[PDB]
């Protein structure tokens, strides 16, 4: 979820970075005092840096608590044309990810599952029956009610495919 939200920003990063720099004040609005200067004083306008690397060091300030929420959001509204609205809860999604990761060390039943996974992932040569051996041992640790998932990884194509399993 974080990766999908972050990546779509970096894909725009080349187009947006050029756009932010090249925008110019209208001469008839600069002689008079009309253009908003609130963000420039606060520094939350991506004039001096590439957009994506700047979005991170703004998020790092959000978790740190230095930056107010309504000022973090408004800076991405003017910088990305409202396109990047998904990065409004990067502080909370990061929190929930850590909380779930904490469950992995605790919940000694779950930790024993990744006890088996690490051994399997380290195994270069796995027979077809070895996977079934790996699957059945993992099934022993879950209750007969819980529905285990299969997350599958392809190293050459960095492709991750999740299968939903509710077998015997």
């Amino acid at each position: 979820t974080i990766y999908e939200r972050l990546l779509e920003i970096k894909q725009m990063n080349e187009r947006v970075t050029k756009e932010i720099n090249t925008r110019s004040t209208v001469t008839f609005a600069k002689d008079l005092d009309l253009l908003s200067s609130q963000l420039s004083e606060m520094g939350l306008d991506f004039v001096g840096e590439d957009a994506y690397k700047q979005v991170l060091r703004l998020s790092r300030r959000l978790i740190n608590g230095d930056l107010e929420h309504q000022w973090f959001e408004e800076s991405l509204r003017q910088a990305y044309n409202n396109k990047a609205f998904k990065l409004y809860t990067i502080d909370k999604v990061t929190q929930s990810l850590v909380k779930h990761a904490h469950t992995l060390m605790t919940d000694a039943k779950t930790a024993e599952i990744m006890a088996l996974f690490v051994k399997d992932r380290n195994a270069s040569t796995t027979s077809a029956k070895d996977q079934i051996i790996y699957r059945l041992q993992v099934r022993s640790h879950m209750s007969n009610t819980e529905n285990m998932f299969r997350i599958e990884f392809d190293k050459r194509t960095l492709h991750v495919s999740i299968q939903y399993i509710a077998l015997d």
């Binding site: 925008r23 110019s24 209208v26 008839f28 609005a29 002689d31 009309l34 253009l35 908003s36 044309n81 409202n82 396109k83 609205f85």
Partner: protein, 410 residues
């Protein structure tokens, strides 16, 4: 037959060099509907104020159409209705109670002071725009003051009292055997569709938001009756249509119509309501996605008339009407506003852009294919084949107007 395709920058076509004729009556800005009413005839004045500062008056020909007479207004509207319009004023509302219910006037479409005069400015503005095309004097007519497509024969609906477009089209119909009407206002153009539903001499292709949205007509199955069967074409779009998806629908359909039913003239009603941010309309069209509609229809090369129609946010519609006036004159305008009297409106970057919103686009390609399939199924049947007339008097307004609009203030 709906092929999703990314939007492309608006490119001007050097093949067509049309000589435009712009219809601006200076008074049309000074009429106001009510205390909180959405229709604001001010938007014509700002949209004209912006135009003069780009120097577009160097290419266009500025005209002031003679206001429509009481008789000429009646060639569509019944004599009882027009007679009610002339007398009705805010002080006279007590005297007229049966009429004000019979004629839906004064409650949502208010009886503001100058009701007759403003309607008289709209019609002579569109009617003569058709009259100049017929004589061959201009290949384009631009009448932003008019375009009121919601009015009916004896009823005022959707802020529109006098339905000028019908008056405009009837003027074209006296020379051109077939006329095409294209609607891009978010509401259904029931005023023009219901007027020409029977005849085959006019095809009323209208894009609108269906789903109990005013006026709740224009369903896909409405294709006219009698002779004018298949000669009506409604495209019911859903909420949140945007720049790239609108082009993938507008262009294929229009290209089909001008092939199968070859029009001799086009009346394109450039509605402002479709733009993003308007108070009554719900689409996500930006300027480039909206002005592209005009540029496509122009590229075909047949005489057309551009009418203003409805626009409810003065800031957005005044910008897009100025950009569309640029495209017709074969000039793509710079994204920098020039100093004009109504300068404080176009905040906050003070550039000529209508920024698309974030709202979720719901039209789905599976749905749009089914709508565009049924239309193409129908369109294969539409194979081709003190009175003043041809009001022509125009008045040559620019000598009077050049000092307006063009500002060297500092």
């Amino acid at each position: 037959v709906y092929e999703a395709t990314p939007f492309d920058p608006i490119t001007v076509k050097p093949s067509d060099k049309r000589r435009v004729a712009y219809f601006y009556d200076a008074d049309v800005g000074n009429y106001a509907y009510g205390a909180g009413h959405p229709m604001k005839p001010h938007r014509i004045r700002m949209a004209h104020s912006l135009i003069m500062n780009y120097g577009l008056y160097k290419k266009m020909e500025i005209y002031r159409a003679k206001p429509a007479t009481k008789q000429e207004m009646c060639q569509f509207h019944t004599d009882e209705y027009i007679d009610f319009l002339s007398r009705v004023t805010p002080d006279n509302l007590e005297m007229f109670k049966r009429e004000s219910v019979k004629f839906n006037v004064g409650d949502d479409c208010p009886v503001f002071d100058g009701l007759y005069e403003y309607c008289s400015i709209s019609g002579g503005g569109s009617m003569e725009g058709a009259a100049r095309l017929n004589r061959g004097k201009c290949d384009v007519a631009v009448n932003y003051a008019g375009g009121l497509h919601h009015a009916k024969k004896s009823e005022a609906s959707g802020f529109c009292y006098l339905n000028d477009i019908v008056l405009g089209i009837i003027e074209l119909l006296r020379y051109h055997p077939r006329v095409l009407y294209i609607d891009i206002d978010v509401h259904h153009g029931d005023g023009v569709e219901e007027a020409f539903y029977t005849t085959d001499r006019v095809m009323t292709c209208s894009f609108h938001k269906y789903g109990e949205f005013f006026p709740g007509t224009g369903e896909l199955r409405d294709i006219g009756v009698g002779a004018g069967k298949n000669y009506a074409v409604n495209v019911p779009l859903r909420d949140g249509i945007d720049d790239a998806t609108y082009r993938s629908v507008f262009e294929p359909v229009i290209k089909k119509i001008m092939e199968w039913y070859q029009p001799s003239a086009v009346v394109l009603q450039c509605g402002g309501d479709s733009l993003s941010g308007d108070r009554l309309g719900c689409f996500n069209l930006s300027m480039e996605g909206h002005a592209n509609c005009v540029n496509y229809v122009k590229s075909f090369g047949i005489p057309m008339m551009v009418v203003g129609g409805g626009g409810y946010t003065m800031r957005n519609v005044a910008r897009t009407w100025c950009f569309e006036t640029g495209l017709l004159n074969n000039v793509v305008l710079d994204k920098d506003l020039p100093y004009n009297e109504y300068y404080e409106y176009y905040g906050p970057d003070y550039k000529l852009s209508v920024r698309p919103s974030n709202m979720f686009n719901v039209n789905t390609p599976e749905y749009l294919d089914k709508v565009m399939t049924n239309i193409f199924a129908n369109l294969e049947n539409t194979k081709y084949a003190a009175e003043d007339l041809g009001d022509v008097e125009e008045d040559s307004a620019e000598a009077k107007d050049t000092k307006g609009g063009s500002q060297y203030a500092r």
